[PDB]
Amino acid sequence: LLREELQLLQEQGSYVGEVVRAMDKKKVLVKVHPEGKFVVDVDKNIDIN
Amino acid sequence: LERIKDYLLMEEEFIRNQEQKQEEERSKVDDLRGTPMSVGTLEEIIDDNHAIVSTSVGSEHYVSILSFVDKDLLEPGCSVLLNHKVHAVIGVLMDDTDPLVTVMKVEKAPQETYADIGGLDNQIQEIKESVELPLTHPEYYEEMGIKPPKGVILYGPPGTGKTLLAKAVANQTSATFLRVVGSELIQKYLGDGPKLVRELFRVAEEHAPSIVFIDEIDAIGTKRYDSNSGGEREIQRTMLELLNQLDGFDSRGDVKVIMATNRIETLDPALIRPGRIDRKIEFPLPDEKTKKRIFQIHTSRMTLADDVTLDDLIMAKDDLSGADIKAICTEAGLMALRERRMKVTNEDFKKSKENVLYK
Amino acid sequence: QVEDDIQQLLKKINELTGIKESDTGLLAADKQTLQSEQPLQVARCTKIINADSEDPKYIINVKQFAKFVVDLSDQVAPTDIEEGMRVGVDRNKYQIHIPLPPKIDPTVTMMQVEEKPDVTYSDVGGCKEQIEKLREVVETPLLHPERFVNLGIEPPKGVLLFGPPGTGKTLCARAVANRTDACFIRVIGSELVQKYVGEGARMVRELFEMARTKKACLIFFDEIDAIGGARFDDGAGGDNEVQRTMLELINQLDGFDPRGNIKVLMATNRPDTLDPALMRPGRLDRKIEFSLPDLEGRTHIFKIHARSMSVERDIRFELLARLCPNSTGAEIRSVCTEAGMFAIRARRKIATEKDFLEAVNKVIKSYAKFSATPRYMTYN
Ligand SMILES: Nc1ncnc2c1ncn2[C@@H]1O[C@H](COP(=O)(O)OP(=O)(O)OP(O)(O)=S)[C@@H](O)[C@H]1O
Ligand SMILES: Nc1ncnc2c1ncn2[C@@H]1O[C@H](COP(=O)(O)OP(=O)(O)OP(O)(O)=S)[C@@H](O)[C@H]1O
């Protein structure tokens, strides 16, 4: 069944980005790789701290 | 008995200050906004509630604005919030933070007070009455309608205590302190002097009541560097920008300026005119009385073995400064902890005298 | 106490009373309008190269992407889509919608004054002829184009100012900038010195762009020695970028379609290292100068700095003016303020004559070793 979970690789990708500093209202500021900056959201699992 | 009613009503006003549907309106503002809030750059503003921005690659868009935040917090050269899907102006972003500020602004209580200065008593009241008494006590000047003295030049031979005087003013203060050594106005790129000057005084005029202390500014003329463009015909333009920034246009404001030199005769006198700088203060090698205070205070916190006389050290050099006194009072301690001791004998001072002076 | 407790009770009574409306009424100040701005458009801006014949058939370089041949939408005018014109273009179908003002190089936007510093004509008394001539040039055509037309002349479109430092040049400029009524534009002379070659030229270009767009404006130049004074030529190639900046300042000022409704004021401290192309009239016409206030000027400047300060009016001022033979208004100001500071040594509310004598021998005779004008009166 783990080998039959191959429809997971076929979906999409994900970015690596650099954090400058966070701010209020559960958000951060990320300067991804070549581009500018983006105020984005956190997931449920990570700590803002 | 006004404490009870005053406290009750003031706490009611403070809780009504926190008492300022509504959650539905917050959710609607969050619906208008995108979650990946992208950052842009203004170039111009068009008055019809949509303006031009500039993305990080260079693409530029006529986009409207989600007008609840104050758009008039924004100027050319500002940072905004934009969308991915419509690129519209989500709103204002608070300002980026702050390498020039964090470098050039002394944040901390920065050393000892007027209990450490060695017997000046007349220069001190001048810098007192030029900075401290104006700023901390702005009540006398209203009575006479006389503007405070603007600039103060400290000068004199090296070792007399310009740096101490600046640190002591920076101790007892209520204003933001800004320190730039004057030798940092010589850059290896062309046209970098006026940028530093305009950023420095932009920081000063935007932040607070302030004290901009610019130290050893006389080395900007008498020190040519190989790590430079065309030297004197850029240095002169830098001095001219400093001049115009110091006493130019548009209601100068609450900015105090104190400068300190070794030599004064190599200065362009256009800085040294009044209107810019009103007080010029000499720092001479003092006497043979306040030296006793200097040796006393620089030996006030040590286990001094009482078999020494400070008058043996006063007579020693005819033109010693407080630099020499600090040097001997520390080198004797370095000789003391070389041999695991606490108290300091006479030959320690003899070796320290023969180490500091004649080498 | 009673005012404090009763004001606390009244203001917090209004606050906690409107708290009923705060907790009872359940941003939206624009929300429906902003969602009606959702059928609006992203409108990317561009730059036009040229047009074509018999048809619109417009050609556009966007900024970085590519160059496209486009057509205009239906809500445009087929006329004002001329060449070199920043227009907003549709992202999907690539069609032109609105022409706009051009690029202004936003580091040049921040030298329009946008305010009015409060400096009145009363602060430069004792310079009556200079005020008269500079009034005649700057103020009169913008407020009265009557004598200048009905007699058929042209007013001098440029005026330079000079003198020793601290003589009132900056102060006269600000006095004009109070009662200017025009788009007064400040220019520090060091603003035209950038890292890259020929960049200050583009700054001058954008200055005269702003000048030609807005009719009947003022441009103030300030310390033009940094902008460029001499063309010393050697086998070194030294001060040259400054020289090209100065030449571009020359040509777009005056020559081959002159300037329009713009007046330039320059102000230097050393008007001696100047290339005589600037000294040619038609560019810099009236040489208004500020000498030192001779005798009655300093009496009047004592009246200026003394009219709003706590003094003993039983004293004179002429004896004070007689001890200041070569002195500027700045030194006068230092005398007045320092006499006040000697009054702060004691605890008084009125000056004495002796306070002013202390001030004179404190400023002039003591700091006359520096004094700023034994080597600028010769205009070195
Ligand atoms: N009048 C004084 N009383 C006591 N200590 C002094 C005095 N003058 C100088 N010092 C000592 O000298 C140190 C301060 O150095 P400064 O005299 O201010 O050096 P400086 O010569 O002003 O350096 P500059 O400004 O580049 S010339 C202090 O740490 C003191 O120990
Ligand atoms: N004739 C005057 N009458 C009254 N106040 C004067 C006079 N001249 C100078 N002052 C005062 O002294 C100040 C200095 O004059 P400024 O014109 O600012 O000096 P300046 O034009 O900057 O000279 P520089 O250094 O060559 S740019 C003025 O702002 C006035 O407050």
Swiss-Prot record, chain A:
- Which pairs of Cys residues are joined through disulfide bonds in the record? none
Which domain of life does the UniProt lineage start with? Eukaryota
Q: Please state where this protein is localized.
A: Cytoplasm; Nucleus
Q: How does it assemble?
A: Component of the 19S proteasome regulatory particle complex. The 26S proteasome consists of a 20S core particle (CP) and two 19S regulatory subunits (RP). The regulatory particle is made of a lid composed of 9 subunits, a base containing 6 ATPases including PSMC5 and few additional components. Component of a complex with USP49 and RUVBL1. Interacts with PRPF19. Interacts with TRIM5. Interacts with NDC80. Interacts with PAAF1. Interacts, in vitro, with the thyroid hormone receptor (in a thyroid hormone T3-dependent manner) and with retinoid X receptor (RXR). Interacts with ERCC6.
What task does this protein carry out? Component of the 26S proteasome, a multiprotein complex involved in the ATP-dependent degradation of ubiquitinated proteins. This complex plays a key role in the maintenance of protein homeostasis by removing misfolded or damaged proteins, which could impair cellular functions, and by removing proteins whose functions are no longer required. Therefore, the proteasome participates in numerous cellular processes, including cell cycle progression, apoptosis, or DNA damage repair.
Q: Which family does it belong to?
A: Belongs to the AAA ATPase family.
Q: What is this protein called?
A: 26S proteasome regulatory subunit 8
Q: Which gene is transcribed and translated to give this protein? A: PSMC5
Q: Which section of the whole protein is represented?
A: 58 to 106 of 406
Swiss-Prot record, chain B:
Ranges of biased composition (kind: Basic and acidic residues): 21-33
Question: Which residues pair up as cystines?
Answer: none
Localization recorded for this chain is: Cytoplasm; Nucleus; Membrane
Where is the cross-link described as Glycyl lysine isopeptide (Lys-Gly) (interchain with G-Cter in ubiquitin)?
Answer: 167
Stretches that traverse the bilayer: none
Positions with a binding annotation for ATP: 156-163
Topology versus the membrane, per the UniProt entry? Lipid-anchor
Q: What does this protein do?
A: Component of the 26S proteasome, a multiprotein complex involved in the ATP-dependent degradation of ubiquitinated proteins. This complex plays a key role in the maintenance of protein homeostasis by removing misfolded or damaged proteins, which could impair cellular functions, and by removing proteins whose functions are no longer required. Therefore, the proteasome participates in numerous cellular processes, including cell cycle progression, apoptosis, or DNA damage repair.
Q: What is the recorded name of this protein? A: 26S proteasome regulatory subunit 4
Name of the coding gene: PSMC1
Q: Which residues of the full protein are shown?
A: 65 to 429 of 440
From Swiss-Prot, chain C:
User: InterPro entries, from UniProt?
Assistant: 26S_Proteasome_ATPase, AAA+_ATPase, AAA_lid_3, ATPase_AAA_core, ATPase_AAA_CS, NA-bd_OB-fold, P-loop_NTPase, PRS7-like_OB
Q: Transmembrane segments in this chain: where? A: none
User: Which keywords are on file for this protein?
Assistant: Acetylation, ATP-binding, Cytoplasm, Nucleotide-binding, Phosphoprotein, Proteasome, Ubl conjugation
Which domain of life does the protein's organism represent?
Eukaryota
Please give one Gene Ontology molecular function term for this protein.
Answer: proteasome-activating activity
Record-listed ATP binding positions: 163-170
Q: Which residues carry this modification: N6-acetyllysine?
A: 63, 369
GO terms classed as biological process: osteoblast differentiation; positive regulation of proteasomal protein catabolic process; proteasome-mediated ubiquitin-dependent protein catabolic process; ubiquitin-dependent protein catabolic process
SUPFAM superfamilies assigned: P-loop containing nucleoside triphosphate hydrolases
A Pfam family that the UniProt record links to this protein: PRS7_OB
Please give the GO cellular component terms listed in this UniProt entry.
cytoplasm; cytoplasmic ribonucleoprotein granule; cytosol; extracellular region; ficolin-1-rich granule lumen; membrane; nucleoplasm; nucleus
Quote the PTM field: Monoubiquitinated by RNF181.
Which cysteine pairs are covalently linked by disulfides here? none
| Gene induction | Expression is not cell cycle-dependent and occurs throughout the cell cycle.
Tell where it localizes: Cytoplasm
Provide the family line: Belongs to the AAA ATPase family.
* Subunit annotation: Component of the 19S proteasome regulatory particle complex. The 26S proteasome consists of a 20S core particle (CP) and two 19S regulatory subunits (RP). The regulatory particle is made of a lid composed of 9 subunits, a base containing 6 ATPases including PSMC2 and few additional components. Interacts with NDC80/HEC; this interaction is detected only during M phase. Interacts and SQSTM1. Interacts with PAAF1. Directly interacts with TRIM5.
Q: Provide the protein name.
A: 26S proteasome regulatory subunit 7
- What organism does this protein naturally occur in? Homo sapiens (Human)
